[PDB]
Amino acid sequence: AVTQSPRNKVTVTGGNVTLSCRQTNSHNYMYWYRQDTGHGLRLIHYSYGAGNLQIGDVPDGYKATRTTQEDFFLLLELASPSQTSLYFCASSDAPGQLYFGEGSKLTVLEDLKNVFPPEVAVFEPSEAEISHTQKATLVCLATGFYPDHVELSWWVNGKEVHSGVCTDPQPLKEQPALNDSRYALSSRLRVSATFWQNPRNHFRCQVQFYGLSENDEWTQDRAKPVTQIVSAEAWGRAD
Amino acid sequence: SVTQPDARVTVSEGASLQLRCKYSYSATPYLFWYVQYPRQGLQMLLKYYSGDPVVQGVNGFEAEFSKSDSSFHLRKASVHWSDSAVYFCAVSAKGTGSKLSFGKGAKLTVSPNIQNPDPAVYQLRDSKSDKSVCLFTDFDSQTNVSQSKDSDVYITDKCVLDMRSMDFKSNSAVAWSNKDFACANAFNSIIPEDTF
Amino acid sequence: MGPHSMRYYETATSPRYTSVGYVDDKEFVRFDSDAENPRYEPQVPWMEQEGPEYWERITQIAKGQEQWFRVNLRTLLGYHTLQWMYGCDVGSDGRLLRGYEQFAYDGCDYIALNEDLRTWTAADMAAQITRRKWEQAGAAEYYRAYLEGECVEWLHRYLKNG
């Protein structure tokens, strides 16, 4: 029962970021790790109890504080792009046996003007698939977004669904040659043909984007690309 | 330090699994395996402190400690699609047993067997407008979807969905371009009998 | 050579945690959390030749131990002296004859590892709770790793130091 906060965060270089972790289940050992592709998990700092701090393998640029037995904080006092990562808190009650929180995804950006929310569109099942397979696949496309920090979900009749869903594990770069490319992401929701052909059924692809915060500075003429949800919907259709 | 020799492994559903792990400490350390399902933190699958070299875990996983080879390979008799996950060997040194270090991880893809493949590419239109997408679907798990050599043409990897109430799984990839783009040429090595 | 033994006796008394090491029933190191410099110190001249890295290492072990002892003391107040005694006897071949892990509270046995280094003796209903936690978490295998490995190795080291 390890709880970490915020689950998602975006900041500019030089920003101040604190990650919080609390554990209710009465453990002594607590840990902060980052996970990066090519590196697995690397330990940043850890602690055996209130007031104890021990440096891990990759402490540079991080400080930590263990103020109570329940609470373990990770501080990025001057955030740098290299600290873009997925961060995990863990606690333990037995040597090497660790219980993990759900992760805090952080992006550190150098230039807030590279930031763009996704556009989202839903594409309706083809009638050829409907006839051939008795099934109907809707596609959702989220495109043109930066940074690569979105969560896509499907909602049918106002309820989140997971069955019949597959969303690409990683967004692709719209300009794969560029380090700073915007991204796009696809997902499918497959339902029986009869479910799609009922016009009383409502479908919505929802993309939560993490971008600028209310406290972020912005003076440009496009809308501030804030953290926001962009969605597209379709009702079922009999044809 | 622990080393896992392959960053990605694919096995067929129903087949056996071994994921390898070697450790570099001289003195036998405390050894562990963890799994991380998509979008979650890690969960301990098993551990070894001393004694019996073969240790049992949750969900049919075992691992075997070999003093000789300084290894601790994970095995499972038959894997299911739901075992697709990243698996991490981990160690802590004797005398610093609470400082746990992880290997780089092995991404396991378990490919489902597609019983009645019906490969096809369908064109789907935007619910709102002119805009279209191409859906390649219902192909067998041995089909590779290849990437576009064209900046302006976007093609995703294959994605397995599971229509649970139907007990029916299927592969698909999506291709699109804001461009004379046609679905009959959007896709890669595809099966000649796929529907267009 | 002939038989030998090492033991540590750790006590936390409400609290002042103390740890004393013995080799062949002779005290050789000591830690007390009441001294000006709560830190393991040698008690015999032959331990003095251990470099500063050693003393720093086991001191940090000791502070961590203080923590474990408060958590488990308060734990016990839930369901004074907390005592942990552990260590090893070795035969003339220098090999492990017997390992010990004995936990006691206020002069009464709480839980102790059996001679098999696999199973636990507990008396209290509460100790039956602990036995439960530890059977599941593999505590016996962990301690067995120490008793069969490090405990023997450190004892030979300290016999040589003499």
Partner: peptide
């Protein structure tokens, strides 16, 4: 050398 208790009662 002394040992970490590791486990909690």
């Amino acid at each position: 050398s002394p040992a970490e208790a590791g486990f909690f009662l």
